[PDB]
Amino acid sequence: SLIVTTILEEPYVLFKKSDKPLYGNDRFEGYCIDLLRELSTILGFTYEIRLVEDGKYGAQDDVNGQWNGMVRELIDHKADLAVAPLAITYVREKVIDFSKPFMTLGISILYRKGTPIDSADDLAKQTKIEYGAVEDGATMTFFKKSKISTYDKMWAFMSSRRQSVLVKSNEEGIQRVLTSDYAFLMESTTIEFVTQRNCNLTQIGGLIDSKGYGVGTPMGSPYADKITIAILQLQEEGKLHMMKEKWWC
Amino acid sequence: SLIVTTILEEPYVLFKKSDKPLYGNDRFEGYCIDLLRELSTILGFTYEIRLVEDGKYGAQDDVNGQWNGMVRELIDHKADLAVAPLAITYVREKVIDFSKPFMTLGISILYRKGTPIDSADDLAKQTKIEYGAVEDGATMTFFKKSKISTYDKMWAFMSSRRQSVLVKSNEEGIQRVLTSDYAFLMESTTIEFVTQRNCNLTQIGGLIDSKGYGVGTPMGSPYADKITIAILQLQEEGKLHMMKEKWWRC
Ligand SMILES: N[C@@H](CCC(=O)O)C(=O)O
Ligand SMILES: N[C@@H](CCC(=O)O)C(=O)O
Ligand code: NA
Ligand code: NA
């Protein structure tokens, strides 16, 4: 029976609502939970879902080299799978393995409609409107490591105000955009969910990069390639598309 | 040195235009040739480019189990890599390995502008406008296997008209759209290149599926994971985007 680590994140993973108490895997629902169930049907495994304790996706500490979040769970073999909106990135791929992508996306900007802001460059050239990202995720790492002037500029701004502009979760960032003059750097798939529910909000500019979400496994795990094959079947049958429609003004 | 199989297909791989005759790797240019060059630098290998002899991408004969095209070259261990617009697919992943995607795309429709045709369903429910795809490619195979009624019906139409409506290459399909009442089922990245050069053509409807192009290797090859990591590096530093812009350019 596989241990599956995951993280709360609408509409990928949420606590299911019921008038009565819920237990075990039945406590969860969402795109990624449907995915996991489909994978289990194809590959024939049983599983137990566990929310990652530190509530983080996974990044490496620049001082002591320690990983955290779901990535660390995999490295340490505390979980067999990570099934979540987990970005496949160069630094992660060096320490854990990934199925091929079940969704493709990119970093973009969440802000309000009807403003003069039309791009990342517009944000970088000013300081009145604050902007930030989720702490310890792929988006933050992209800016921290970027050698592109605009993004390097944006990282200087964010890192000099880490405490005030970086947030612990997408939900926290979305709330900042809704209640203050703030633009949030986040993934395009998730922006699409937000903007279908918050009609005053919109994506600003296009995609800043491109990346996929993959199922994570410890490095060398035979499940990575098996899950790739199952994902390809699910995509080709139209199932992933139906799941997207179900979960996603 | 590695042997690299590939296929001619604008703007991924082209014969370089020249008055002088060119030899060896010098003969080729394109998005996929730049990709290959970048990978060679990162991974530190040299290589010989060879066009796949049978001119096919790769499909399995549903009677005798035999594969052809670039997939076959890899299976037979005749090539170390296939660097081309080669779709990562369920059936192929069972017989060869792939890097993670350097490009993401979907099946869509290439047709003329100004008509009421707005979706695959609109094509499926009539016969006056013929439609088809590249023979023995991932696009045709998607239709051949789909349980979706609309796509199953389109397959019945195409398979029963194999000789007239399935073509040997994107190029032939594009010419057919331009010269006759015909809609061509083809990959969206390639449609984008075409519609930027032909202002009377357009994509019809959205993407019908989603897939990626990856570098193919024999199953079990150490190069699959190594190339994944190199692709991730190229993406993250902005090079894949610059490469697309260069070759795609109303
Ligand atoms: N999905 C991201 C977290 C959210 C973000 O960074 O925008 C990751 O895998 O780290
Ligand atoms: N790129 C496709 C060929 C073109 C198509 O099928 O539309 C393949 O890998 O088979
Ligand atoms: Na890895
Ligand atoms: Na494989």
* The three-state (H, E, C) secondary structure of B130-198, written as one string: EEECECCCHHHHHHHHCCCHHHHHHHHHHHHCHHHHCECCHHHHHHHHHHCCEEEEEEHHHHHHHHCCC
Residue A2, strand partner residues: A47
Tokens of B44: 């530190």
For A1-105+211-249, CATH gives 3.40.190.10
Question: Does B139 count as an annotated binding residue?
Answer: yes
**Exposed, middle or buried, A127 (CB in 10 Å: 0-12/13-18/19+)?**
exposed
Tokens of A247: 């979960």
- CA angle, A152 then A158 then A164, to 5°: 180
Cα separations (Å) of B95 from A78, A101, A208, B67, B148? Answer: 32, 19, 35, 10, 25
Q: Ligand 3 centroid to B228 CA: how many Å?
A: 9
CB A88, CB A210: distance < 8 Å = no
User: Which ligand sits nearest to residue A71's alpha carbon?
Assistant: 1
A86 lines ligand 1 (CB under 6 A): yes
Rounded CA-CA distance B118/B7 in Å is: 32
**Exposed, middle or buried, A231 (CB in 10 Å: 0-12/13-18/19+)?**
buried
Q: Which residues of chain B make contact with A104, given a CB cutoff of 8 A?
A: 101, 104, 210, 212
Rounded CA-CA distance A248/B68 in Å is: 40
Kindly provide the resolution of this structure in angstroms, with one decimal. Answer: 1.9
Rounded CA-CA distance B88/A101 in Å is: 11
Q: Which of B43, B47, B196, B206 is nearest to B121 (CA)?
A: B206
CA dihedral over A114, A118, A120, A121, signed as positive or negative: negative
Asked, colleague to colleague, whether A1-105+211-249 and A106-210 share their fold, the answer is yes
**Exposed, middle or buried, A128 (CB in 10 Å: 0-12/13-18/19+)?**
exposed
Q: Which residues contact A222 (CB under 8 A, 6 or more apart)?
A: none
Rounded CA-CA distance B213/B85 in Å is: 6
Q: Which residues contact A245 (CB under 8 A, 6 or more apart)?
A: none
**Hey, what CATH topology would domain B1-105+211-250 get?**
D-Maltodextrin-Binding Protein; domain 2 (3.40.190)
Q: Which of A240, A245, A241 is nearest to A36 (CA)?
A: A240
B138 lines ligand 2 (CB under 6 A): yes
Rounded CA-CA distance A27/A50 in Å is: 11
Domain ranges of chain B: 1-105+211-250, 106-210
Tokens of A155: 């990282």
Single-letter amino acid code for the residue at B217:
T
User: Which ligand sits nearest to residue B75's alpha carbon?
Assistant: 4
Rounded CA-CA distance B212/B110 in Å is: 19
Contact (CB<8Å) B147/A237 = yes
Contact (CB<8Å) A232/B98 = no
User: Which ligand sits nearest to residue B213's alpha carbon?
Assistant: 2
Single-letter amino acid code for the residue at A140:
M
B27 CA to chain A: closest CA distance, Å?
A: 31
Q: Which residue in chain B has the smallest CA separation from A138?
A: B236
Contact (CB<8Å) A212/B94 = no
Rounded CA-CA distance B32/B203 in Å is: 23
Rounded CA-CA distance A203/A167 in Å is: 19
Rounded CA-CA distance B85/B104 in Å is: 10
Tokens of A147: 């050698």
B78 CA to chain A: closest CA distance, Å?
A: 23
Cα separations (Å) of A87 from A98, A118, A137? Answer: 9, 26, 9
Q: Ligand 2 centroid to B239 CA: how many Å?
A: 24
Tokens of A184: 């949030």
Number of CB atoms found within 10 A of residue B94's CB: 11
- CA angle, B12 then A87 then A133, to 5°: 115
Rounded CA-CA distance B86/B88 in Å is: 7
- Pairing between β-strand B81-82 and β-strand B2-6 as defined by DSSP bridges: parallel
Rounded CA-CA distance B15/B115 in Å is: 35
Terminal Cα distance for chain B, rounded: 43
Find the CB nearest B93 among A104, A209, A229. A229
Find the CB nearest B101 among A212, A236, A240. A212
Q: Which of A50, A62, A57, A85 is nearest to A72 (CA)?
A: A57
Tokens of B188: 């969206």
Class of B106-210 per CATH? alpha beta
Tell me the best of B134, B176, B207 to mutate to test the pocket of ligand 2, counting ligand atoms within 8 Å of each CB and taking the most: B134
Cα separations (Å) of A29 from A203, B43, B61? Answer: 26, 42, 41
A138 lines ligand 1 (CB under 6 A): yes
Rounded CA-CA distance B208/B176 in Å is: 21
Single-letter amino acid code for the residue at A26:
D
Single-letter amino acid code for the residue at B70:
M
Q: Is the Cβ of B234 closer than 8 Å to some Cβ of chain A?
A: no
Q: Which of B167, B134, B171 is nearest to B8 (CA)?
A: B171
Strand residue runs (E) in chain B: 2-6, 14-15, 28-29, 47-51, 81-82, 96-98, 103-105, 107-112, 130-132, 182-187, 201-204, 211-213, 216-218
Residue A109, strand partner residues: A185, A204
B132 lines ligand 2 (CB under 6 A): no
Q: Which residues of chain B make contact with A148, given a CB cutoff of 8 A?
A: 238
Rounded CA-CA distance B40/A34 in Å is: 40
